[PDB]
């Protein structure tokens with residue numbers, strides 16, 4: 477029971493606390509530093525001793541107490557201390573607009589989920605910002621685009637090859653994630669690099685999201701300009717200080733011509749790594765047979781705009797609509813968002829989260845079981861009376877400190893129970909809710925709140941206008 481486990485690269489020793497075995501800081505790839513910067517993840521060098529896996533590894537460098545370093549490719553494992561073997565495995569992919577976050581953030585501690593559901597929970601870090609979503613393929617074929625996604629895939633491959641040694645079932649892996657993590661999963665469900673790496677998926681407030689191959693190249697060129705590196709000095713991309721990359725990143729990202737509706741960092745179309753839009757691939761059966769639990773919060777947009785924040789600018793406003801819907805649809809939908817704070821908030825909720833989620837769920841419904849939800853809960857009294865983006869996270873993980881009444885603990889039990897039953901069976905039904913399958917004829921949706929309810933074809937008027 478001292479928890480020494482042999483991974484394919486060497487032994488690691490975790491610890492046991494409050495009924496949960498824990499291993500933190502397990503390397504799953506060679507540190508992507510120096511010559512390995514901007515290249516696909518490689519296997520880490522094997523070690524012959526026993527790694528004290530009781531502390532989180534560094535997180536990927538990002539704008540800001542945890543240590544940061546490009547040497548950040550680590551996974552963490554939480555398993556229940558029970559005689560039960562071959563357990564379902566839930567792999568978490570954190571969000572953060574592709575330039576923020578870490579699998580080791582307190583909110584994602586998997587101890588409670590592991591103990592309550594008797595499942596294994598894996599958290600991980602993947603390259604972010606200029607390290608993981610700066611696509612340099614146009615400059616050197618040796619470089620890979622969508623590095624952050626490749627890292628996630630490598631972590632999933634690590635799970636497939638090593639989780640049995642930790643007591644998990646590599647054939648019952650559920651990948652789940654929120655925001656950028658949900659958008660990442662949208663891509664992983666279709667990407668060549670992630671084929672066969674998981675059997676179920678949960679997409680929270682995030683779906684198909686990509687930038688064009690052309691845009692990726694444009695941004696890449698702008699980055700090198702700021703760095704003062706031309707096409708005959710690419711060697712310097714491997715010796716330049718990480719801080720210089722972070723500096724260039726913030727400079728370009730915060731540029732006046734940049735807005736929240738158009739993510740500066742995000743997956744990019746690329747023949748080698750992500751050939752086409754995830755949604756399109758799914759619509760053609762790329763994720764056949766993979767059950768999908770997907771949803772959004774009712775008031776997503778209120779997290780990005782405050783009562784006294786910037787108010788539109790039809791210029792950049794109409795540009796957002798065309799970018800998110802295409803010129804033809806943008807014109808037909810313009811009517812829904814008359815310039816105003818309210819409209820920009822609704823644009824965020826509807827076009828960055830809701831429409832993508834419904835489009836993805838609809839596409840997948842023709843190839844696998846799909847279950848859709850909308851999270852409505854929030855305190856009644858202002859100023860926190862909105863089902864803000866990410867508000868369901870504390871409930872999913874059972875880590876409620878971020879918010880604790882009995883109703884809060886009750887809602888967390890209801891939500892976490894469904895996530896657990898889904899990981900185990902592919903159906904999120906529990907004693908508290910018989911979850912109806914989502915398909916295009918009825919669009920039955922579960923409404924998560926203190927009291928569970930079901931809405932058939934919710935916001936149908938908005939659906940007809942946006943589709």
Ligand SMILES: [Zn+2]
Pocket residue numbers: 477478479480
């Ligand atoms: Zn032992």
